[PDB]
Ligand binder design. Structure first.
Ligand SMILES: O=P(O)(O)O[C@H]1[C@H](OP(=O)(O)O)[C@@H](OP(=O)(O)O)[C@H](OP(=O)(O)O)[C@@H](OP(=O)(O)O)[C@H]1OP(=O)(O)O
Ligand SMILES: O=P(O)(O)O[C@H]1[C@H](OP(=O)(O)O)[C@@H](OP(=O)(O)O)[C@H](OP(=O)(O)O)[C@@H](OP(=O)(O)O)[C@H]1OP(=O)(O)O
Length: 138
């Protein structure tokens, strides 16, 4: 409806890290009818309701199927995994006004069905990049 984003999660428990690989998106929704978009992807590491880190891909001008292939590493100790949320947002860069939200993804053990599945797959396959498509929720 708003597009899909393909990303992988790799949780290395001995290293206490989660690597987030923003791979690509497809069928992004444009602002106008028949127009284009300038998508970039934001990644926030959350602990409870507090932001721990923020990351950001480069922008892909005039591209509704952007390829990013960017990886971000986050430190997460075991005692905070249960309170961890990774929020991924596909944005639409606008030089004139405020950048619009295309879709958001909340990754944790207590999120939507597709998000919980991806999270559990990450937990169950430590040290493997688990990749999965996600519908973008407005
Ligand atoms: O000025 P922009 O290129 O549009 O980006 C800003 C900028 O983020 P970056 O500087 O990390 O690129 C803000 O951060 P500051 O420079 O003030 O530190 C950030 O604000 P917060 O990180 O404090 O949230 C804001 O994001 P927000 O939408 O949450 O206000 C974000 O704007 P975009 O996400 O729309 O690009
Ligand atoms: O949804 P996925 O499993 O990730 O695979 C898709 C899918 O490929 P298959 O349908 O053969 O699995 C697309 O195919 P169509 O829906 O068009 O039939 C294809 O798109 P194109 O063949 O039209 O190129 C795309 O390839 P790409 O994203 O490189 O354009 C490819 O993505 P994967 O690279 O993830 O296989």
């Amino acid at each position: 409806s708003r597009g899909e984003l393909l990303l992988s999660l790799c949780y290395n428990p001995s290293a206490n890290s989660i690597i987030v690989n923003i791979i690509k998106a497809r069928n992004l929704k444009a602002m106008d009818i028949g127009g284009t978009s300038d998508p970039y992807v934001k990644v926030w590491l959350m602990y409870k309701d507090k932001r721990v880190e923020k990351k950001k891909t480069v922008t892909k001008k005039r591209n509704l199927n952007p390829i990013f292939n960017e990886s971000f590493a986050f430190d997460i100790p075991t005692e905070k995994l249960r309170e961890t949320t990774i929020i991924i947002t596909v944005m639409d860069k606008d030089k004139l006004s405020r950048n619009d939200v295309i879709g958001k993804i909340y990754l944790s053990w207590k999120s939507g069905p597709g998000e919980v599945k991806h999270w559990k797959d990450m937990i169950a396959r430590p040290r493997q990049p688990v990749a999965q498509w996600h519908q973008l929720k407005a």
